[PDB]
Amino acid sequence: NVNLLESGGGLVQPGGSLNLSCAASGFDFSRYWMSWARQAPGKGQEWIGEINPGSSTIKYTPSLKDKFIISRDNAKNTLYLQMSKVSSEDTALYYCARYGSYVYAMDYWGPGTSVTVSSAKTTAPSVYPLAPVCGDTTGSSVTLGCLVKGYFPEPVTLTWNSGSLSSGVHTFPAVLQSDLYTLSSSVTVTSSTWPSQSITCNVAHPASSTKVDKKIEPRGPT
Amino acid sequence: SIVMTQTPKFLLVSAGDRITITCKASQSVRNDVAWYQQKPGQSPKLLIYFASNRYTGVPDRFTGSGSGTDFTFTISTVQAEDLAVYFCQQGYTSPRTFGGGTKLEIKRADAAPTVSIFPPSSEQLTSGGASVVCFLNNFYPKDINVKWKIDGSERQNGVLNSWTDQDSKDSTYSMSSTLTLTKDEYERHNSYTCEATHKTSTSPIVKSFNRNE
Ligand SMILES: *[C@@H]1O[C@H](CO)[C@@H](O[C@@H]2O[C@H](CO)[C@@H](O)[C@H](O)[C@H]2NC(C)=O)[C@H](O)[C@H]1NC(C)=O
């Protein structure tokens, strides 16, 4: 049951260094070629490089051959990427991928690990529950919000009720404002569900070790 | 270093239609072309390899063809779930480079936005900032315009909008708008309006509230 998980992403200063890793399972890692690619905000995919099972062949896209180093340890089922002398051109989502047998084509892709190259500082999000307008009127459904404001860098993760509320959810792309990201999410449930049952949004910001929950309840006195 | 030129960049098409995407390589690359789909939120999955072969599990609707410098990718009968970005790759030689991609979106019946407005959270005003949030969910087509009105006057500073990609569940779009004021700006006025204009209606959709109620 093939799987890949990329790690090591995060914020790094311009000029600096950072080591990504990728943990593979579900296949004989020592039998397959492996590679890396990346995707910058708003742009196409880009091939970074490849490595054969024996590490005897390693190739790079020309612009990266002297910054980036690719390596692997078959004993640990792990692929590595050493990034050095980074600039903002390197801010992107980083994917590791397996090459299919007998093809130079990427068979399976990991979820990716986000890398940000920046002089700006890590900042934890503020998280705000949004309840409907005070004068509650009966409609068939009701819509709630969760606002995640002023964090850096990407990513933040947001769920409702620890993921067991998945339908009727809309989580919007974050937007940047003077070195700080803001994000929001809406969930729509039928009115016999809320407020009779509770609805909580759960936010994680790994870069700042933030794990914060907000329970959503009608506006008014307590 | 070989360039892969992919056209068109964008495709809007109806369910059932056939579409064809074209990739042109700056030099001969034999038969060594692969095609990928990248659904929203998800990592690429491989569809076609060596120009014309379907990877394991890939449905019949998907086909490819081409040799030398001209390559095509075809979906015979487009389905909503096929909403994704599609891109090519040559793997003839290193660097094994990608085409720019084609975005695929699907037609459906026109749908009016469901609109909801939100006064600043109780938990926020203490920090000295105030955010009024408006959700515009599940509409089609994708072009929509939002005006913020404060006590009758349109307000344009401090507005941030964000858009979801099209949803493959119902082929719709959603949008979020946020007005950012200092707490002081917010406390000086009483009524806040969120105003949606969309071709599905001749009058804007207005959701509104009063600061004390
Ligand atoms: C990234 O990984 C590299 C390679 O594993 C690290 O550099 C090695 O560090 C050892 C110390 O255990 C040295 O003896 C080697 O000479 C280093 N090798 C190379 C090629 O430089 C490096 O420390 C890691 N960097 C970060 C930021 O974690």
Residue numbers in the entry:
A (entry chain A): 15 to 236
B (entry chain B): 25 to 237
The authors write:
Sequencing and annotation of the P. falciparum genome has supported the identification of new blood-stage vaccine candidate antigens, among which the P. falciparum Cysteine-Rich Protective Antigen (PfCyRPA) has a number of noteworthy properties. PfCyRPA is part of a multi-protein complex including also the PfRH5-interacting protein PfRipr and the reticulocyte binding-like homologous protein PfRH5, which binds to the erythrocyte receptor basigin.
The parasite inhibitory anti-PfCyRPA c12 mAb binds tightly to PfCyRPA with a Kd of ca. 1 nM as determined by surface plasmon resonance analysis. Because of these favorable properties, we chose c12 for epitope mapping by determining the structure of a PfCyRPA/c12 complex. In a first step, we determined the crystal structure of c12 in isolation. We obtained three different crystal forms containing a total of four crystallographically independent Fab molecules. (B) Overview of the c12 structure with a glycan located at heavy-chain Asn37. mFo-DFc electron density for the glycan is shown as a red mesh drawn at the three rmsd level. The high structural congruence indicates that the CDR conformations are genuine and not dominated by crystal contacts.
